[PDB]
Design a protein around this ligand. Structure first.
Ligand SMILES: *[C@@H]1O[C@H](CO)[C@@H](O[C@@H]2O[C@H](CO)[C@@H](O[C@@H]3O[C@H](CO)[C@@H](O)[C@H](O[C@H]4O[C@H](CO)[C@@H](O)[C@H](O)[C@@H]4O[C@H]4O[C@H](CO)[C@@H](O)[C@H](O)[C@@H]4O)[C@@H]3O)[C@H](O)[C@H]2NC(C)=O)[C@H](O)[C@H]1NC(C)=O
Ligand SMILES: *[C@@H]1O[C@H](CO)[C@@H](O)[C@H](O)[C@H]1NC(C)=O
Ligand SMILES: *[C@@H]1O[C@H](CO)[C@@H](O)[C@H](O)[C@H]1NC(C)=O
Ligand SMILES: *[C@@H]1O[C@H](CO)[C@@H](O)[C@H](O)[C@H]1NC(C)=O
Ligand SMILES: *[C@@H]1O[C@H](CO)[C@@H](O)[C@H](O)[C@H]1NC(C)=O
Ligand SMILES: *[C@@H]1O[C@H](CO)[C@@H](O)[C@H](O)[C@H]1NC(C)=O
Ligand SMILES: *[C@@H]1O[C@H](CO)[C@@H](O)[C@H](O)[C@H]1NC(C)=O
Ligand SMILES: *[C@@H]1O[C@H](CO)[C@@H](O)[C@H](O)[C@H]1NC(C)=O
Ligand SMILES: *[C@@H]1O[C@H](CO)[C@@H](O)[C@H](O)[C@H]1NC(C)=O
Ligand SMILES: *[C@@H]1O[C@H](CO)[C@@H](O)[C@H](O)[C@H]1NC(C)=O
Ligand SMILES: *[C@@H]1O[C@H](CO)[C@@H](O)[C@H](O)[C@H]1NC(C)=O
Lengths: 364, 97, 125, 124, 129
């Protein structure tokens, strides 16, 4: 004999279509700041973060639905912003016809602005207000909020640029560690700085150098090797390494600095086997690139004349292991762009509140 | 277990097939669990194996679900079985020189 | 609009389940307040229309208006028959909601018919 | 409660009573003004659609059967109110054709149907 | 507040009338009482929101009474009778002294010392039953 109720604090975990909310400007012609006026509402003027009292909820990071909601829109952002001159998407029907295409392609400006992902009517967003949350499992102090923090859609491989940093020690999160097929998203507790300048001597045009401090990088990776021995043994001799190979976009730390796609060289950045000045990254502006939005190459205009620079805040390390014993080889990875934003949407979850239960009391 | 016979130095196509046809992440390992290939989004990523300069895949077929591995310069010490992990279905394929 | 209060105990919910309704200049950004004035008001008409569309279900099962209603559909054994003591003692309403997965869809299907059987019972006397 | 809620006016009233219970740059810097202004039009239509539901739950409450979809009452039919054979007006007739028939007496049915609850309020 | 704001004013129509003649017309009245330029459009919308931040307030103030009537048994009924016995300790007056020579306002000056106790007795009487 069941008893229907209509007051229960019961929420499901549902999936819906969120709406963006960015701090736009509506006069600037920066190509992010012209999309953010077109498909984003402004920032919520009165934001409210109610802290739930004593509820613990089993989150999950790798099966989130915001990080495939986010991936639909930065695919839709890099189709209005950076229109290449020649684009070859492999349409197929071995008989795959490399369908060329052409359009206008002027040089534009490009910088990531923070974008909040809000929740529609009837849904909530449950923040994981903790410090040691390893991505999967019960968050203890789950608050609630309507919109996420300022997340900037910076697309890069091998190094999560410009992202937020952990207030506690260096976090290490993978979907299944000791799988040797899943990336290991390290997240920094301090912002390692990196300059990336194209010089002004007009002789090469497409050649740049990137300076990272030797004091900060040997100390920050000195923190990472300690907590990597937490999920591993205590006396493992881990070996950092160069990236293995593949395409240029994942062998080398690639990004886009003001409209020109840099391709750096982090072989001197992972060159140490761990036990118990300024590094110079030889970069190169490329012009025939692969695309991360889909399969297919794309060609752009030559770079602009003046000095090109962007000082940054590497706050992430998408490493990758390989399975021989008593050691570990940790070469860098990244490239699947969903890992570039689930490093920043890990403490969020969209739910909906369903207030109708049928408890046992066995009445009549 | 499927077995594919390639003689010497040629190119084989150790096929592997998905269902939903949307280029999900796969990999290719061996008996000691060492990575041969790897999909990363829309790019490709090798691993520290013996086929480091010998492995490649047909990129245009990933959108249809077929995720093959094509090894060139087939030497003698590549005889093993290979593990293609599409979603969970580790479809093993063995190779003989 | 009828939300919850923190969960955190099944038995202490049913005491406080009643009391949630038993007693009770900018001029510069006129798009930051007008867009978010609708989105904070579209979420107050939905909290009214979800109440009226859920008093419509309890109107079908004869439970319209009553918060804690009692009905004549017996427990099958195949709906995760746990201990009836410790359900109310140390459990949250979230944890009980996981304890039935797909039986909620077939619990509701009997209550639509048991009232229609009771519709064919009260008019057959 | 909605306004585009029943656009399922089919043919069989017996089937209609069955489904009676089961229920990119166009901007030019003005696309935040199109979605704000017509956001109000979708809110002045939904709120009035609520207050039509509450205006009718008081009218079904005077007839005693409030909060319920199919209201069965205790007053019989007549001969003036299109005395058909309960087959031509229940299996092959749309509701719009049925509403057009008894429209002369809908204001006359509602008077006595109020009185049939007041008699059931006398035995209390 | 044009929808259900004019209903609350219509409740006070027969104030000061006697208690029998005011309760007799509850059923009668409730059926009858429930019956752009450039600079303009970013100000004429706040005149459309503020006229809906009070019209919705007339809805969720009216439904906070039917959620209260529904706890005490009858929901949707205006005149409704309950299985709870009237203690004479509330007021020691016969019914001849009540529905003939009193107005509804004098009850708030008579039973509001006890009017939170009656609301608890009306709760359990339609809870266990
Ligand atoms: C991480 O976050 C930081 C913080 O935002 C990012 O660093 C910023 O990066 C942008 C671009 O990389 C940079 O913006 C430039 O600032 C210069 C002044 O500081 C501007 O002069 C410059 O404008 C010119 O360059 C644009 C490039 O497309 C042109 O489109 C634009 O019209 C301007 O062009 C004029 O000048 C050039 C010569 O430079 C000439 O050829 C043209 O004809 C024209 O005359 C940019 O706006 C910010 O200054 C950086 N911020 C800081 C603090 O340094 C960083 O990019 C983020 N990381 C990643 C990976 O994105
Ligand atoms: C926290 O949990 C304890 C468990 O004993 C409970 O008694 C307490 O009420 C909870 N805190 C709050 C604020 O509800
Ligand atoms: C993680 O990977 C290891 C190695 O294959 C495996 O044994 C383990 O079952 C995996 N974890 C899960 C939850 O599948
Ligand atoms: C980078 O470092 C080298 C050596 O320290 C120095 O010569 C060069 O000028 C630096 N470049 C920038 C842009 O700081
Ligand atoms: C980067 O450049 C800025 C200014 O050019 C300088 O203040 C900062 O110290 C540099 N950082 C590194 C790590 O070289
Ligand atoms: C600097 O790097 C070396 C290895 O390259 C390491 O052994 C040393 O401990 C580092 N310095 C500090 C202060 O940690
Ligand atoms: C980086 O990779 C290239 C080719 O894969 C290799 O020649 C080079 O030695 C690597 N760098 C280091 C430091 O191993
Ligand atoms: C740069 O990359 C080449 C191969 O791409 C590698 O051989 C070399 O060691 C790298 N050098 C640095 C300083 O990263
Ligand atoms: C990088 O590694 C090579 C060989 O692995 C070594 O010769 C070189 O000194 C290293 N450079 C630094 C800065 O440690
Ligand atoms: C990098 O991080 C530091 C935090 O200490 C911040 O002050 C600085 O503005 C950041 N630089 C950016 C976002 O370009
Ligand atoms: C429409 O009419 C056809 C033919 O009479 C019938 O088969 C069909 O069920 C009807 N559909 C609806 C939705 O009324």
């Amino acid at each position: 004999w069941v008893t229907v109720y209509y007051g229960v604090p019961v929420w499901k975990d549902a999936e819906t279509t969120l709406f963006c909310a960015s701090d736009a400007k509506a006069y600037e012609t920066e190509k992010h700041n012209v999309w953010a006026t077109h498909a984003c509402v402004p920032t919520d003027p009165n934001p409210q973060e109610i802290h739930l009292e004593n509820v613990t909820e089993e989150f999950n990071m790798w099966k989130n639905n915001m990080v495939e909601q986010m991936h639909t829109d930065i695919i839709s952002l890099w189709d209005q912003s950076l229109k290449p001159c020649v684009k070859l998407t492999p349409l197929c029907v071995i008989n795959c016809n490399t369908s060329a295409i052409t359009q206008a392609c002027p040089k534009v400006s490009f910088e990531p602005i923070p974008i909040h992902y809000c929740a529609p009517a009837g849904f909530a967003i449950l923040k994981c207000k903790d410090k040691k949350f390893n991505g999967t499992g019960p968050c203890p102090s789950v608050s609630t909020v309507q919109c996420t923090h300022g997340i900037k859609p910076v697309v890069s491989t091998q190094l999560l640029l410009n992202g937020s940093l952990a207030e506690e020690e260096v976090m290490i999160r993978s979907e299944n560690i000791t799988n040797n097929a899943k990336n290991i998203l390290v997240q920094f507790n301090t912002p390692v700085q990196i300059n990336c300048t194209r010089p002004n001597n007009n002789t090469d045009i497409r050649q740049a150098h990137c300076n990272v401090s030797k004091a900060t990088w040997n100390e920050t990776l000195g923190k990472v090797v300690k907590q990597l021995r937490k999920h591993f043994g205590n006396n493992t001799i881990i070996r950092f390494a160069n990236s293995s190979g593949g395409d240029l976009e994942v062998t080398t730390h690639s990004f886009n600095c003001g409209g020109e796609f840099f391709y750096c060289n982090t072989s001197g950045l992972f060159n140490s086997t761990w036990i118990s000045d300024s590094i110079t990254l030889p970069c190169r502006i490329k012009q025939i690139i692969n695309m991360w939005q889909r399969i297919g190459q794309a060609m752009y205009a030559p770079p602009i004349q003046g000095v090109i620079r962007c000082v940054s805040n590497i706050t992430g390390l998408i490493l990758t292991r390989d399975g021989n014993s008593t050691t570990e080889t940790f070469r860098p990875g990244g490239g699947d762009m969903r890992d570039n934003w689930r490093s920043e949407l890990y403490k969020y979850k969209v739910v909906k509140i369903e207030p109708l239960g049928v408890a046992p009391t066995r009445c009549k | 277990k499927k077995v594919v016979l390639g003689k010497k130095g040629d190119t084989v196509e150790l096929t592997c097939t998905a269902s939903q046809k949307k280029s999900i992440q796969f990999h290719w390992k061996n008996s000691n669990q060492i990575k041969i290939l790897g999909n990363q989004g829309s790019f490709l990523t090798k691993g520290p194996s013996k086929l480091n300069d010998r492995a490649d895949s047909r990129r245009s077929l990933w959108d249809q679900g077929n995720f093959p591995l094509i090894i060139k310069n087939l030497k003698i010490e590549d005889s093993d079985t290979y593990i293609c992990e599409v979603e969970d279905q580790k479809e093993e394929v063995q190779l003989l020189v | 609009g009828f939300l919850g209060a923190a969960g955190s105990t099944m038995g202490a919910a049913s005491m406080t389940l009643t009391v949630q309704a038993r007693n009770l200049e900018a001029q510069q950004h006129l798009l930051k307040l007008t867009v978010w004035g609708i989105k904070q008001l579209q979420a107050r008409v939905l909290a009214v229309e979800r109440y009226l569309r859920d008093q419509q279900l309890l109107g079908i099962w004869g439970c319209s208006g009553k918060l804690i209603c009692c009905t004549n559909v017996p427990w099958n054994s195949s709906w995760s028959n746990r201990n009836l003591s410790e359900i109310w003692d140390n459990m949250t309403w979230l944890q009980w909601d996981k304890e039935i997965s797909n039986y909620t869809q077939i619990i509701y299907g009997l209550l639509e018919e048991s009232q229609n059987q009771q519709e064919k019972n009260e008019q057959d006397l």
